[PDB]
Amino acid sequence: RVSSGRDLNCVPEIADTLGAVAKQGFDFLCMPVFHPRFKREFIQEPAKNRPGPQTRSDLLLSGRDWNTLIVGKLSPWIRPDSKVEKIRRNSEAAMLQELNFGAYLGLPAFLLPLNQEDNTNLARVLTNHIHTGHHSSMFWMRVPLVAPEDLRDDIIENAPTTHTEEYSGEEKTWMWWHNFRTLCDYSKRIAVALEIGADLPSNHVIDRWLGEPIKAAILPTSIFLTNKKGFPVLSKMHQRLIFRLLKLEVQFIITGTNHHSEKEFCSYLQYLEYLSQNRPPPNAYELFAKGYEDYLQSPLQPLMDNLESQTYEVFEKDPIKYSQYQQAIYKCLLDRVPEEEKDTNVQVLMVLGAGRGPLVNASLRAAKQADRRIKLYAVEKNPNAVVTLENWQFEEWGSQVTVVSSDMREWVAPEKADIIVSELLGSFADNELSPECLDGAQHFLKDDGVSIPGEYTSFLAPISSSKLYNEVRACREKDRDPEAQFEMPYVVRLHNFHQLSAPQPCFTFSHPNRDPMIDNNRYCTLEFPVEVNTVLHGFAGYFETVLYQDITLSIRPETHSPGMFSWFPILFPIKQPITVREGQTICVRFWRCSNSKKVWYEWAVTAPVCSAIHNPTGRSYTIGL
Amino acid sequence: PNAPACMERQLEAARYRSDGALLLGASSLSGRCWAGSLWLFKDPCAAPNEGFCSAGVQTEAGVADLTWVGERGILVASDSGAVELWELDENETLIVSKFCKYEHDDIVSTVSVLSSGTQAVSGSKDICIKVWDLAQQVVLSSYRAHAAQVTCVAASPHKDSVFLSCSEDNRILLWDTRCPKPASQIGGYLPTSLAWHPQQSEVFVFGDENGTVSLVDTKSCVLSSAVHSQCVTGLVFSPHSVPFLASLSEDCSLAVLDSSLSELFRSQAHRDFVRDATWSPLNHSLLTTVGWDHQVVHHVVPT
Ligand SMILES: Nc1ncnc2c1ccn2[C@@H]1O[C@H](CN2CCCC23CCNCC3)[C@@H](O)[C@H]1O
Numbered sequence: 019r020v021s022s023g024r025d026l027n028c029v030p031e032i033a034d035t036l037g038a039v040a041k042q043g044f045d046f047l048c049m050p051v052f053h054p055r056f057k058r059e060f061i062q063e064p065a066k067n068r069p070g071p072q073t074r075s076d077l078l079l080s081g082r083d084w085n086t087l088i089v090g091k092l093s094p095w096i097r098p099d100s101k102v103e104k105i106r107r108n109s110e111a112a113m114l115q116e117l118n119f120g121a122y123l124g125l126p127a128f129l130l131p132l133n134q135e136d137n138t139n140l141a142r143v144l145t146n147h148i149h150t151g152h153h154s155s156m157f158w159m160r161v162p163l164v165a166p167e168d169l170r171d172d173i174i175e176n177a178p179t180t181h182t183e184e185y186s187g188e189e190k191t192w193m194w195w196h197n198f199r200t201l202c203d204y205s206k207r208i209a210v211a212l213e214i215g216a217d218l219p220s221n222h223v224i225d226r227w228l229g230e231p232i233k234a235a236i237l238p239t240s241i242f243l244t245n246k247k248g249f250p251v252l253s254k255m256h257q258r259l260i261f262r263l264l265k266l267e268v269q270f271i272i273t274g275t276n277h278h279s280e281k282e283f284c285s286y287l288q289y290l291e292y293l294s295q296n297r298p299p300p301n302a303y304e305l306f307a308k309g310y311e312d313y314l315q316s317p318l319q320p321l322m323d324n325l326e327s328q329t330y331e332v333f334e335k336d337p338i339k340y341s342q343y344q345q346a347i348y349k350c351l352l353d354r355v356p357e358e359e360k361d362t363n364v365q366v367l368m369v370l371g372a373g374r375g376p377l378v379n380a381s382l383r384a385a386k387q388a389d390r391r392i393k394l395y396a397v398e399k400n401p402n403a404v405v406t407l408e409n410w411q412f413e414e415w416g417s418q419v420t421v422v423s424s425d426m427r428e429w430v431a432p433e434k435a436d437i438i439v440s441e442l443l444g445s446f447a448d449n450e451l452s453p454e455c456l457d458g459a460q461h462f463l464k465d466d467g468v469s470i471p472g473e474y475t476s477f478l479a480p481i482s483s484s485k486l487y488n489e490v491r492a493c494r495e496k497d498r499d500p501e502a503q504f505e506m507p508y509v510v511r512l513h514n515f516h517q518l519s520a521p522q523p524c525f526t527f528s529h530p531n532r533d534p535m536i537d538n539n540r541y542c543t544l545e546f547p548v549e550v551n552t553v554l555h556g557f558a559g560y561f562e563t564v565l566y567q568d569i570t571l572s573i574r575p576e577t578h579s580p581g582m583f584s585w586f587p588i589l590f591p592i593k594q595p596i597t598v599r600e601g602q603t604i605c606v607r608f609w610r611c612s613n614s615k616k617v618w619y620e621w622a623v624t625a626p627v628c629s630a631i632h633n634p635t636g637r638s639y640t641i642g643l
Numbered sequence: 644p645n646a647p648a649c650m651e652r653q654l655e656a657a658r659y660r661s662d663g664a665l666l667l668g669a670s671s672l673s674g675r676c677w678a679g680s681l682w683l684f685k686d687p688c689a690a691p692n693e694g695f696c697s698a699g700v701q702t703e704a705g706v707a708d709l710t711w712v713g714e715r716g717i718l719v720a721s722d723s724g725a726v727e728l729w730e731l732d733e734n735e736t737l738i739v740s741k742f743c744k745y746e747h748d749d750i751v752s753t754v755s756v757l758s759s760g761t762q763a764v765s766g767s768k769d770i771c772i773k774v775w776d777l778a779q780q781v782v783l784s785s786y787r788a789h790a791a792q793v794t795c796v797a798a799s800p801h802k803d804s805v806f807l808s809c810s811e812d813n814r815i816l817l818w819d820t821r822c823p824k825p826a827s828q829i830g831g832y833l834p835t836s837l838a839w840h841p842q843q844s845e846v847f848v849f850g851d852e853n854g855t856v857s858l859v860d861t862k863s864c865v866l867s868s869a870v871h872s873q874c875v876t877g878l879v880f881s882p883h884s885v886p887f888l889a890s891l892s893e894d895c896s897l898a899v900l901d902s903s904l905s906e907l908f909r910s911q912a913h914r915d916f917v918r919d920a921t922w923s924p925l926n927h928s929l930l931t932t933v934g935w936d937h938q939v940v941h942h943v944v945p946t
Contacts, residue, residue, distance in 0.1 A: 027749045027768065028704050028722040030678045054750060054768075055707060055722070056653075056672035057893065057916070062872070064914045065895050068935065070652065071673050078675065094768060094792065102832065102853055104873060133791070166770055167790040167812070174788055174816065175824035240748060274748030274769070275724045 020264065020294040021045050022287055023089060025236065025273035027054050032078045036087060042284040048089040048129055048271060051119050057095050060111035061104070072115075076123055084123040089158065092116055092130045098139040106139060113143050121153035127233070129211060132161040132194045141201035148207055158211040158234055161195050163227075164188060169215050185600070188219040189551055192226055196553070199484065206488050209233040211271065212263075216241050218255055222550045228262060229482040229516030229552075235263045239274040239286060250278045250286050252293075260293050266514060302581040310586065311513035314489045317444055317588065318509075320371070321451050322642035324400045330374045333441075336584045339571060340380045343439065346470050346565035347384035350437055354468075355390040364391045365436040370426040370459055372396035374406040377439050378420075394418075395435075397459075399425045427458030434464040438529075440471070445509050445573070445588040447474040447561035448527055448610065451617055451641055453538040456529045469529030474563040476524040477574050480546050480554050480604045481589075483515035487555040490591045498638075504593040505632045506639035507619070511586045512558055518598070519546035521560055521574055524608050539612055545625075546604035553595040554604060554623065559588035590621055592629050602626045616640040645736055646699030650680055650691055654933035656709050656919045663925040664697070665690055666717065667933065670705030679706040681717055681729060681738050687923075687931060690939045698731065700738040708754045710763075712777060716741070718763055720751035726765050728777060742780045746773060755798040755806060764806050766793030772808055774820065788816055788826045797837040800844070807847060809834035815849060817861065829859060838878040841886055848888060850875020856890050856904055868904035871896065879920045882927045887944065889930055891917035897932050899944050912940040 023046035029035045032049075039047050052058075052073040059065035076084070093116060098109045120128045130144065144157060168188060172179040180187065195210060202208050211234040212227060242250040252260070263270075272286045300308070318325065347367070355363040369377045378396050385392045398404050398421070407421040422429060438459060442452040456469060463469065489510075493503035525540045560574040572578055573585050598604060605625030611618050618636030623629040633639050656668035665684040671677055679702035684690040686697075693699065705722035712718050712728070717738065719727040728741040749768035756763050762783070763775045772793055774784040791811035799805035804820040815834050816826040836850035845861045854871030856878065871892035881887035881899075887907065888900040893916050899908035908930075915936035923929030928946045933939050 028677070028724065030704055031676055053670075053672040053677055053705070055670070055705065059893070062894065065893065065916060065935075068915050073673055074675055074677075100852075105852065165790075169787070170790055171787045173786055173824050174814075174826045174828060175822060177814075177828050238748065275745040 020270065020290055021267075022270040022272065022290060023048050023234075025091075025271050027091070027094075032074065036079070036083070043287045044272075045269075046087050046089060048091055050093065051090040051123070051125075052093055052116055054091075054094050056093075058108070058112055058115075060108050073119065081124065085126060088123070088125055089127040089129055090116070090120040090123075090125045090155075092128070094131075098143050099134070099136050110139070110143055113140075114147060117144070117147045117155075120155050121151065125155050127156040127158050129158045129160050132159050132191075132198055133166070135190070135194060137194065137198050138201065141198050144208070145202050145205070148202075148205055154207070156233065157208045159195060159198060159208060160211045160213055160236065162191050162213045162215060163219060163223075164215045164217060165190050169217060186551065189223055189226075192223070193551070195230065204484060204488055204491070206492070211236055214238070214241060214256065214259065218259065224259060224262070225516055226482065226550050226552060228266065229484065229514065231485050231514065232263070232266055232268050234269045234271050236271045236273055237286070239272065239277045242277070242286065242289075244278065248278065248280045250281070250289055252289070257293060260290070261297055264294060264297060303583065306583050307511045307586075310511040312483075312485055312489055312510060312515075314493065314508040314510050314589070316509070317446075317449055317507055319450070319641055320400075320442070321455065324402050325373070327402070330403060333584050334374065334376050336582060338579055338582045339441070339584055340376050342565060342569055342571055342579065343377060343380040343441070343470070344383045344387070346569040347381055347437070347439060348388045349569060350468055350470065350566050351384060351388035351390040351392070354436060360390065364393050366395075366433055366464075367392045367437045367439060368395040368397060368431070368435045368462075370397050370438055370440040370455065371442050372398045372407065372421070373400070373403050375410060377441060381439060394420055395431070396421050397424055397426045397429055399423070426455055429459070429462075431462035434462055435467050436464060437468050437470060438463055440469070443471075443474060443561065443563060443585070445561070445585050446507070446559045447476040447563065448525055448538075449507070449588070449619075449641060451643065453527045453531075453536075454617070454643060457531060457536050457538070460530045463530050467530065468566070471529065471563045471565045473526065473528050474561055475526045477521040477560040477562070478524045478544060478557045478590075478606065478608065479521040479560075480518040480548070480606070481512065481515050481556055481558050482518060482552045483512070483555050484553070485514040486510070486512065486589060487591070487595065490556075501593050502638040504591045505637070507559070507588045507590050509586050510589050512589065515558075516550075516552065517558065518548050518550070518552055518554065519604065521558070521576070522546070524559070525610055538610065538617075540608070540610040542608045544606045544608070546606070548598045548602050548604055549600055551600060552598050554592065554598055555595055556589050556591040557606060557621070559590060561585075590619070590632075592623060592632065594629065596623060596627060596629065598626060611636065615643055617643065644694060646682070646693065646696065647680060647701050648693065650682060650693050650699065651678070652937050653935045654691065654918055654937060654939070655706050657921050657931055657933045657939065658709075658711050658919070659921045659924050659931070660711050660714060661924055663687070663923060665921075665931065665939075666709070666711060667691060667939070668706035668709045668719065670707070670722070672705065672935070677705060677722070678702060679704055679721070681706070681709070681719070683731065683735060683738070685735070687939075688941065691937065698736055698738050700729065702727065703743070707750055707752050710754055710756050712756050712763070713760050716777070718754055718756060718777075720754040720765060722750050724749060724751060724767070724769070726751055726754065726763070726773075726775060728780070744780065744782075746782050747771065752793060753796045755796045757798045757806070758801055758803040762803060764796045764798060764808075766796040766808055768792045770810075772796060784820065786825070789814060794833075794835055795837045797839060797847070800839050800841060802844075807837045807839070809837055809849065815859075829861075830864060836875050836878045838880055838888070841880045841882075842884065848878045850878055850890065854892065854894065856888070856900065858904060866904060868900065868906075870898050870900065870904070870906070876916065876918060877920055879922065881922045881930070881944070882924060883946070887946065889920040889922070891920050891932065895934070897930075897942070899930065908942065908944050910940065910942050912942070913938060
């Protein structure tokens, strides 16, 4: 149910050791590839000429076993950053040798420690290795939650432990990691093995780490407590962190010696399994989202592009959305047609963007529950979906052209409407061009006609996510601007990330819009209070919409309509990550720009430093009218 | 005759006892099987020939350190993270396990018997230092004083509660376990080896990773000599009353120094790393050294 390896620093026979460990229930073995005490000379005679096999043979395991079962460990004497020149050079040579052997064996991962501040040379050797030959070992950088220097016992009589609240202090190990991965240029091969100790830092510290690429969490045997029955278990605080780490499908590694000697061994594992079988179960949204975690997609342009049959089908299988549309229209039919007027008053309802008809059936469902009468028009421009409508029309219905195959901005309406009903909203509300589409249909809304929805508002929040920054680089394409990938949004089920400040409103649009200008262009300045040292990699986007009065849809996380599938957040990247200190304000500026052919967003950070303006003139990203 | 067939290549430890017999420990640090052995040579000059030895045995894992405990007993720091007590049988033909306790979380790097011979301290790559009761076969105390690997521990000659430790955190800690805060720091290049003076309660030598040997007084900074071109692995004071200091190193050389740290002997007999040195109790100017080149060398030290 949960994936876990065993960390050993002692392996007398590889086969007996792997077998014992496979028996215990572990999936892999982190072990040394050279003996951890077998220091080697590369320069000075006579020890450079030490004979004999430098380590054990690749033939001791199958290729399949090397490729799936074994994580290598850098030798603990290797100190590329030593202040002694001879050790620095032996260590350079020895690190390339052990990495080369790991590549030679096809290991899936290799563990290197970040156990001090200055890892510049470590970084530079690993970077050279990555740029040498054709190999695809992952590099797991073993970094503690708490530096050893900060969890030492206060038993040195003339060197006491720094006592009071030391604020950037128990964030030192994050800066170790950040300096290292910045030196290595955010390489996608360099991830984190986070080593957990007896004590824990801030919820904020643990929050930053969960925006970082954690592939493994390392649990020492020593941090486990004992229950009555004599089994190993964890503090309620350590249980919280497991619960969060399981929510990133990280691998668990058990390190150190057996400390529960009445209770066999595999019991540490048994306990991780226990915690795992015993988290709250996925909600409806979490089940459906599984598979989409940090997968970047192009936002749909349903105006420019004719949606596929199977795209409509995911938007249709969203009962809570159509349930809320049904209620909004019901409440509208009741405010519009008094009870005396019940059977004389036919309300004219038009569905604008009817697709394959679910808002039409919502309008019907509404009409029976409100017991008022309606005359229905369904306007769709996608002639593919028009086939689905016109077949349903000729088969059911039989009365009225109902379905009209037309762009709602050209359509000559037989008649003015009481109510226009539409769902032309993307992940950023107005990025499917709802404003332009409704402004062009407005002229056939009666002077007191209602638009459902009546309002929407986009929201933004700054984020950190070094995974999401790499998914964006990976979007570089031949034959365009090498930076174009950063100047466009992505619909993405944001997962491996940190929300740096609470969402605030960006752009609002009302319908109908009787301001004699409309002007759907927009400029907004947003100030985000921050409270960690972090990297800004971009802004998450969300929206909310008023369908009618108090009937709303949201994907803003704090008001998220429960169990609603149709829309994941959007991400606006920035080209260069921006360091932010605790206490600093992130200032961001968004424009909604347009000409008669295109709408786009430009955006810039102005605090605590300026970015370049992103997407100037829609040079990298436009939404076609 | 008597023991395992093939003693492992990498000679780690050599220590004479009172009657002049040689204790050898070894690891295999390469090849299929990464393990360890103990040997008694009631004739030094034969060693390391397995056939013509008095006793020996297979350990589960590598031997990183060991020390004699009195006459019968051998105390072992294992790669397995275990501290082991082995003992000679009455006939000193067999070496039997008395205890194997897995209490450290990584390799045990260094071990040292206290004053009284009843207790011992271990240091480990797990960063911890531990005080053992050898009769009760339990850890009495565990200290996380250091911020990195423990390179060396060294029991005081005469005081059970006092010993030195040093670490890759650039600290030399002087410990007295009768204080609430038992450790005190003493002034670097990383310290790599420790020995107490056998005639001054107050004094000790330390070797650094850069090849310098340093003489330190508790009472008082230092006095120093650039003796080696790399890591000082070991410092063992000779058994004389104005004693010599044997220094060994990864530069594959042994030096013997006077009390002013001036050079008297130098040997390049070794072709790999020199791991240990022990002075004959019969002939206070026989010095025996061992190395990863599998040589046991017998030097006559000019005195
Ligand atoms: N000017 C026009 N005139 C008429 N029809 C128009 C437009 C602009 C868009 N459409 C259509 O509206 C529908 C919107 N669909 C329905 C479910 C999925 C969704 C809504 C949520 N976001 C993704 C698209 C589609 O069927 C479009 O083809």
